[PDB]
Design a protein around this ligand. Structure first.
Ligand SMILES: O=C(O)[C@]1(O)C=C([C@H](O)Cc2ccccc2)[C@@H](O)[C@H](O)C1
Ligand SMILES: O=C(O)[C@]1(O)C=C([C@H](O)Cc2ccccc2)[C@@H](O)[C@H](O)C1
Ligand SMILES: O=C(O)[C@]1(O)C=C([C@H](O)Cc2ccccc2)[C@@H](O)[C@H](O)C1
Ligand SMILES: O=C(O)[C@]1(O)C=C([C@H](O)Cc2ccccc2)[C@@H](O)[C@H](O)C1
Ligand SMILES: O=C(O)[C@]1(O)C=C([C@H](O)Cc2ccccc2)[C@@H](O)[C@H](O)C1
Ligand SMILES: O=C(O)[C@]1(O)C=C([C@H](O)Cc2ccccc2)[C@@H](O)[C@H](O)C1
Ligand SMILES: O=C(O)[C@]1(O)C=C([C@H](O)Cc2ccccc2)[C@@H](O)[C@H](O)C1
Ligand SMILES: O=C(O)[C@]1(O)C=C([C@H](O)Cc2ccccc2)[C@@H](O)[C@H](O)C1
Ligand SMILES: O=C(O)[C@]1(O)C=C([C@H](O)Cc2ccccc2)[C@@H](O)[C@H](O)C1
Ligand SMILES: O=C(O)[C@]1(O)C=C([C@H](O)Cc2ccccc2)[C@@H](O)[C@H](O)C1
Ligand SMILES: O=C(O)[C@]1(O)C=C([C@H](O)Cc2ccccc2)[C@@H](O)[C@H](O)C1
Ligand SMILES: O=C(O)[C@]1(O)C=C([C@H](O)Cc2ccccc2)[C@@H](O)[C@H](O)C1
Ligand SMILES: [Cl-]
Ligand SMILES: [Cl-]
Ligand SMILES: [Cl-]
Ligand SMILES: [Cl-]
Ligand SMILES: [Cl-]
Ligand SMILES: [Cl-]
Ligand SMILES: [Cl-]
Ligand SMILES: [Cl-]
Ligand SMILES: [Cl-]
Ligand SMILES: [Cl-]
Ligand SMILES: [Cl-]
Ligand SMILES: [Cl-]
Ligand code: NA
Ligand code: NA
Ligand code: NA
Ligand code: NA
Ligand code: NA
Ligand code: NA
Ligand code: NA
Ligand code: NA
Ligand code: NA
Ligand code: NA
Ligand code: NA
Ligand code: NA
Ligand code: NA
Ligand code: NA
Ligand code: NA
Ligand code: NA
Ligand code: NA
Ligand code: NA
Ligand code: NA
Ligand code: NA
Ligand code: NA
Ligand code: NA
Ligand code: NA
Ligand code: NA
Ligand code: NA
Ligand code: NA
Ligand code: NA
Ligand code: NA
Ligand code: NA
Ligand code: NA
Ligand code: NA
Ligand code: NA
Ligand code: NA
Ligand code: NA
Ligand code: NA
Ligand code: NA
Lengths: 136, 136, 136, 136, 136, 136, 136, 136, 136, 136, 136, 136
């Protein structure tokens, strides 16, 4: 029933990844979750510690997480280790196709511990992740 | 309207990636495509040349492709170059989480030229790809 | 009782790896298998898909395989994944000593999933593999 | 007198490497070979096994080969080993400048066993290879 | 007629590579060599210098060697250089499949200078090596 | 009409790459250029600065260059940057097959900025380059 | 007119990079900016999120940034992506010569997206950056 | 007399590294420090900036630090540079054996600047570090 | 009760790692073990085979080992494989901080199979290891 | 008082790095040096030996050098070793941002021995270097 | 006056590095040392521990060492660390040109701690080392 | 009888590698060569082309060369290829121990084609090379 959507650094700047703003994204996700009979809790922080605290709470609550970690995807072992604690599914989401850009973006610390990964499908990636979780 | 789902080597062995057989997968995909108002053409070959011919035809027809290339994902430049010709969207799909296994599976020749990539969501990955294409 | 000997690309050219022709090799293997009280089914193809189909059938039949994949040894993830399905033993055979040539020949995708590997013992390698299987 | 021109995967799509179609290329090559007093046999396949069979026949016939292997250039040890059997000259041809694109295209399994290599001169590359062979 | 079987570090601990003890292995090898009409001299040391001395003596005597060097396989240039002096055949044997474990075990200093290599066939590997030498 | 043929270090030693001397090469190139209706200006220096000055002048004159840079092929960023200024075609030529020798010769700083590359066709490589330029 | 000088982790410890304190640095920068007819806004944080927020505000305001990111220079993709949004110039500044120390300090995620980089000129580096911006 | 024990990201989750909670760990450390005649100040944060501030204060106070940085061990140059300022001893502690897990955990930015490192001894690692400092 | 302290090559030279001699170290260790209610058996050899024999005996006796292997730490697969047999705890000890010196010293073949590792705490490292074992 | 500005290969082509010609650059530098109360001696050569001779003379005279070595930046150990002799400051200058182009341009042999480095600030880089030296 | 010449594994096999036997080498070295007014003590062992003991004794005696370590050159950190203790000069000698063979022979653990290195000058290398030491 | 001693870039600066000047070195070498009954021709240039010309002349004259190429040792394929033409012996000499400094100095393009190499023995290295050549 409850799903956590957690966005990391710079994702608050979506729109200004253009068109949709983060506020719009939250509204889309919430609308879509309601139709699926889920409740989406969508949060964004540029702070790794804040991110880690949200993940810790999903781990304690055994709630699933859809995570778009931004740059921390490629850099943060700490974030990986927090997510490795999740017992419910973890879907890694990237808006952009991370394999079509700089080589360094083709490595994720999260993918190996995620249930699955969706990249390059834009913001619909989040909606598709919600739908996976509604079937699982 | 028409979407090509193309599965590469070993994908004919799904079930015996267990539970669902390839015949079941075809039926699921077709059922789901019909609901979305699409027509899914689902094919599987262990032959790279056969794969290439299907991709060539999608390129000529400007039809979208959902491709799960199996091992060729990690090895075939030829397949990449055929897919690079597609003008409609190309969604790379892996059933398994390719980042949770051998290191060599973490590189795809296809990802950089794909619209996007879905891994580790099982066969629902294909359904989710269909839904992306129904919105695009 | 039944053992599959599968030879991959270029192995049909043995003799023209000189002296023994592939037809001779088949006759040697069959003669030796009969003495061991086995039946050897020996096949060769330059087609990866044909190879994969033979491996699929050995997997379904739970028959052991002696495989000399030729160049695909060093390149084919698809072949590896088909062989990874075998429940009976898989003996990788190379006629030449692959460690005494180009560096790229020193990596095999097959070895990690094989029961064992025999290289550099010429065609007797196949006979020795048959003898292993006759004890196991 | 007889020269084999062998084109690998995707080369059948030339034109749709734009302008000249493969049929046009065949006609150019044949016209040019006739002027040189050679007979050009020009073939294309997306199938590696078909390619290998053509190379095997050039090896048996001691005929020279001009080979544009497409993506297999960068991936196929099997193809290399077939070509390594050729006793007549082997000219590797690429239409595009393979050194001006992705890093992975800068490695060829064929170059070390080829007589020589022509890249980036477009389809005239094939004509220039024919002319080399007419002097050798 | 005479064949040297030389086992390196830790191979004296076989059994405690379980089931068969080194004493058992010696008895198996000797029994099998007698049937083949050979005399097997089987020795084991954890000392590299002792190993080197045995190899030096096989080189002086032009006797073949079956060598399972244990960890030194992956580390000892000195051992390689002693074995490179052997004029009779050198068969490298590993009980375990060295390609199915840690990456560092996939490199052998010995393979490039060995006649051939047998891995992963258990102690039967030694018997199979003896049989090769009985045909050569 | 005017084409610059520029040879770098050690190419003055051709003959003593044996048979043809550099003087012979110049005469062959000039003879062949005349037949093609071109004027070939052929120069050789062991001095990088001299080379750079010739390239600068071809850049100012918008004249094409056939360049065999010798060892500088593999080492000189300065030479690359001078050649990157050429607006007319740049054909990189190597007499020897640089892919059949030391690994370090398989990298060229020039190839990525050249129109194309001809290697391993001996001195005919230069003639073939002239012919390309006569068609372009 | 307005220029942002942003210092990252540990830069608050300057002096205790010795002699000048961060307070002194701020006073130098402000004095120098006034002479140039600019207004310098100088901030320091050990918090990446705080840094990111400052960069976001410079991006919204189209103000130039002089950034000395400290260790995050070498580690933070998130910081890079925030800076990649800046439309005004971005000058990366390091007090120390990062190429004269540990190898890991020779890579910057920022340099490729910066207008330019000044290292090893001490705190005068900041003054020199201000002067660049006063001319641009 | 005073020793700082600083724990980084995720270490607040110890117990839920299982059995002992962080509160228990603090009590153990304090009990043990008292017996040694030291005062242990034990702190934990998921925030790098908070960590850096604690390290800065130990540097100003010339107090020793026992640091278990969690994932930042493997990623944070900023943390390293703060710790490099410590004039009193710095003992790096890991509860788990970081060399028995993923390859990326086998590199620490901290070790080269630490006095020493204790890994894999569980929470007793902290007690053992305290005892080192009580002798130094 | 019984603990084996095993020192490898060059450790007999401690003092001439200065101050304490190996004889002193033995006396310290023995004194400390007695206080802990253990018996320490402390041995040193420059011979790998001797080392291996001691490890074999600890494995047979299920006694714990504190091992400072010296240079063999970084080189000996054989030693690793002997230690991998230990069923009681194995504590790797280095006197010096191996991460503050040459890069090659930052890899240990032993760490992945050790219970834990203590480096850079001088000879107190051994005492601290004894204390760990007295609690386990 | 006297400062040497030394430009390496291809820098004589500035303008035809566009807009400003090398003659203009010399005039700018001289004008700016005069204002600073310095005398700038500005030289350019495509010859490494000429460069080395200028550096040798600055070393003998203990004069500072601003060096833009062009491609030799990335290739010349000889140049580095000459510059390593300079006792006065050495400022490495690049007009372009060398970190925003080909990977090979991100390594400089000069940076580790330079006082500092300015890249990507265009020709103002030279003026800014002069100003550094006027303060030092 | 006294110089130690120490030869490592396989060097006892010189002659059977052909022509001169080790006994001959000893006689040459002794003859040459006498002429130089030195006393040469020449020893050879295939045992690393024996080697280490000889080096330890040269360190205690502050005697110079000429060392040809054979394969251990490329493998033994232990040997390096013993030699690093020598206060008198250490000349590394190789009979063969180690840079003209396998890539792995181009790395020596000894060179960085040696006074100097002579390779490829055959046994005269030892005589030349003696002469260096007679001048130093 | 005649031996060429060729010194490359920066070697003209010896003394200002301190103590002995290049003029002194020439006098030492000449004095020593005369005693050996040789004639030493000693030359130095900072110009690669000049170096190449000297090597070409030694190749034509079949005279031996002692070469200290300075930085070009590590960078110049052109120089290597000129030296590869020498039919008489080529001794590579370095004054400094190139293995005790920066990693990049541990690779020589010359060593693989040299007869032998002497490093780290100072200027006596040249004298020792002369003595080798006087015996060969
Ligand atoms: O495609 C993604 O969703 C991705 O996770 C996001 C980012 C950054 O947040 C990029 C970014 C930059 C500016 C505004 C919003 C997002 C990148 O750091 C990642 O590489 C990929
Ligand atoms: O997860 C996937 O969908 C993937 O594309 C599939 C394969 C292989 O087909 C694995 C396989 C093996 C046996 C039967 C069916 C599929 C693997 O080669 C790829 O690495 C990943
Ligand atoms: O030694 C082998 O058996 C091996 O599997 C075979 C090949 C190729 O088939 C080589 C080859 C080439 C020509 C004719 C027959 C075989 C090589 O591709 C492999 O590296 C090694
Ligand atoms: O330039 C070439 O001739 C080359 O051999 C060809 C290809 C592919 O065939 C590219 C391709 C793609 C689509 C249609 C035709 C050709 C690429 O795979 C190779 O990297 C280079
Ligand atoms: O499989 C083998 O035969 C192999 O040569 C043996 C070893 C070691 O001896 C492993 C070992 C460990 C304990 C007892 C006996 C053998 C390993 O060092 C090698 O990697 C592989
Ligand atoms: O094949 C070539 O044309 C090539 O450019 C030439 C050289 C050198 O000039 C080799 C050489 C050596 C001696 C005389 C003439 C040429 C090599 O440096 C390059 O690797 C290849
Ligand atoms: O030279 C710089 O300005 C640099 O950005 C700064 C740092 C750190 O902040 C180093 C540091 C450490 C302690 C106090 C102040 C600064 C290093 O992390 C970077 O590698 C280089
Ligand atoms: O073993 C350690 O103490 C280590 O420092 C800790 C971590 C993480 O904090 C792991 C972690 C994960 C969840 C809860 C607590 C700790 C890992 O990031 C490090 O690799 C090793
Ligand atoms: O710090 C250690 O205890 C270490 O195990 C020891 C050594 C060597 O034994 C160094 C040495 C050298 C001379 C005398 C005693 C010890 C080094 O080989 C290892 O890298 C580290
Ligand atoms: O940006 C620079 O100043 C740099 O030093 C210069 C060059 C070359 O000289 C590029 C060049 C090319 C053509 C004309 C002038 C300059 C490049 O070789 C370097 O990578 C960077
Ligand atoms: O050239 C040398 O002197 C060298 O030290 C010696 C060896 C070995 O001892 C080679 C060897 C092999 C057989 C008999 C004698 C020597 C090789 O291990 C080294 O790579 C080089
Ligand atoms: O030790 C040598 O003889 C060496 O060949 C010389 C140099 C340079 O010439 C170093 C140098 C620098 C200044 C004056 C003289 C020599 C270095 O470039 C090489 O790495 C080593
Ligand atoms: Cl990972
Ligand atoms: Cl790719
Ligand atoms: Cl693998
Ligand atoms: Cl290759
Ligand atoms: Cl090897
Ligand atoms: Cl390049
Ligand atoms: Cl980058
Ligand atoms: Cl580090
Ligand atoms: Cl390991
Ligand atoms: Cl460098
Ligand atoms: Cl080293
Ligand atoms: Cl080389
Ligand atoms: Na929630
Ligand atoms: Na999990
Ligand atoms: Na979308
Ligand atoms: Na279709
Ligand atoms: Na496309
Ligand atoms: Na599913
Ligand atoms: Na069958
Ligand atoms: Na299996
Ligand atoms: Na055989
Ligand atoms: Na034909
Ligand atoms: Na051939
Ligand atoms: Na063309
Ligand atoms: Na014997
Ligand atoms: Na041999
Ligand atoms: Na067995
Ligand atoms: Na001209
Ligand atoms: Na151009
Ligand atoms: Na030719
Ligand atoms: Na502002
Ligand atoms: Na920007
Ligand atoms: Na300053
Ligand atoms: Na405190
Ligand atoms: Na410190
Ligand atoms: Na514990
Ligand atoms: Na004991
Ligand atoms: Na164990
Ligand atoms: Na201590
Ligand atoms: Na001057
Ligand atoms: Na200097
Ligand atoms: Na400018
Ligand atoms: Na002695
Ligand atoms: Na020393
Ligand atoms: Na000699
Ligand atoms: Na001469
Ligand atoms: Na030669
Ligand atoms: Na000297």
């Amino acid at each position: 029933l409850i799903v956590n959507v957690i966005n990391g650094p710079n994702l608050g700047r979506l729109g200004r990844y253009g068109g949709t703003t983060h506020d719009e994204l939250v509204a889309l996700i919430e609308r879509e979750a309601a139709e699926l009979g889920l409740k989406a809790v969508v949060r964004q922080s540029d702070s790794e510690a804040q991110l880690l605290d949200w993940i810790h709470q999903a781990a304690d609550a055994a709630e699933p997480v859809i995570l778009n970690a931004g740059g921390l995807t490629h850099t943060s072992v700490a974030l990986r280790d927090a997510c490795a604690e999740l017992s419910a599914p973890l879907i890694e989401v990237h808006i952009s196709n991370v394999h079509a850009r700089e080589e360094f973006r083709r490595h994720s610390y999260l993918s190996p511990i995620a249930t699955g990964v969706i990249v390059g499908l834009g913001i619909q990636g989040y909606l598709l992740a919600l739908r996976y979780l509604a079937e699982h």
